Amino acid sequence: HTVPRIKAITSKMRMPKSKGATVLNLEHLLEYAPQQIDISNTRATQSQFDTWYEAVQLAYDIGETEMPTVMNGLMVWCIENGTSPNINGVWVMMDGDEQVEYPLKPIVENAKPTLRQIMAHFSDVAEAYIEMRNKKEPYMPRYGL
Amino acid sequence: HTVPRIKAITSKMRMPKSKGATVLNLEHLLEYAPQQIDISNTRATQSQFDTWYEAVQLAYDIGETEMPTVMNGLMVWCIENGTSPNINGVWVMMDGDEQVEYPLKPIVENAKPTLRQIMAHFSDVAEAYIEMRNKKEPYMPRYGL
Amino acid sequence: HTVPRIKAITSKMRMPKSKGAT
Amino acid sequence: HTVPRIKAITSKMRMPKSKGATVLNLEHLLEYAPQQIDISNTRATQSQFDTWYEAVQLAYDIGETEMPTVMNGLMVWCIENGTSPNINGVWVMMDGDEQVEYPLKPIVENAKPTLRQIMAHFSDVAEAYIEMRNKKEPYMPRYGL
Known part of the structure; x- marks a missing residue:
């Protein structure tokens, strides 16, 4: 007559009790x-990403309207180079052909609990950027973020 | 009718948010x-290469017109010998058959953050020089710059 | 558009005061 | 039939005797x-905390209604700086942007048997204050109380 469809919560299943x-x-x-x-x-x-992004913007003294353009370079820089850089160093993002230097102290010091997990937010766009360039020219990277 | 070409930035992709x-x-x-x-x-x-190249030219007291000829020998010397030499030593570049000695103190002391990264600029020309001589005579080196 | 170059004297830096x- | 549940005070256990x-x-x-x-x-x-808190209020001549507001600053000051300060010194708590100086003699001299144990009462609220600010801005301290 009617086919018995099993349920997900069986009667003879031990729900935890206290x-x-x-x-x-x-x-x-x-x-x-x-x-x-x-x-x-x-x-x-x-919440920890809202703190790292806000504690980095203050160290660079960059306004909120000029802030996001910096984050484009930070991910691209973090694609060739890994998420464990020298805290006493700088990272580069170009105004065309001219190098612009940014300190790596607020990036690593203010990233909790690890810069790898803070940079893991950019993972979705990292693939969307590597694949977009691979269509034009090879962009075989060395590390990831 | 029309073939659906996928986009690089999919709608259901998590852009980082703050x-x-x-x-x-x-x-x-x-x-x-x-x-x-x-x-x-x-x-x-x-910027750090513009400092090392300018802090070395002053130590040698070599003029800007005689400066670049020295850098030919420095790369060639850095091909056989590695980028970690003795700071209390000298490197040699010939005026034909006569050795000319240059101190290695400004080369290593003024190279930030590492002499390997400062010498990494010459990497493009280093291959263009090793291969050029290999056509004439073997030039199998010992290290690189 | 334009790359933000940081300044040496940041606004949020404590100059000594008297x-x-x- | 009935499962024998063991007792905590076993018969064959040596109670101390005199x-x-x-x-x-x-x-x-x-x-x-x-x-x-x-x-x-x-x-x-x-009892020793009721003495230190009463022997400090008299040295500052602060009324009982204005007394507790001082203890907010004392704990916060004791978070960055350890519980072993200079007895011939002062501690600071702000009326906004203006520093207010309080002597450290009644704090250390009247704390028995140790300022560390007297300040250990504030331990429960010390964590409740460090964590509350860490949500807004980093407050990685240097010592504790």
């Missing part, structure tokens, strides 16, 4: 679907 | 294509 |  | 549960 009650809240557990990247520890939490 | 806004400036990110050697940390930045 | 003046 | 009787009072020993911080010697006893 003093009789259940520690879980299995009516909204099914209505709880976060993205695999927004609850992963491989990326720094948005 | 307080709602976007840290990147993805309208000039695509119009930003620097050379892989001018934003790499394996070579000293042009 | 009775208001520097 | 002249036949028992030195312990093992009927209220089980009904005696103090906090691990209120019987620990790492913090000065409340």
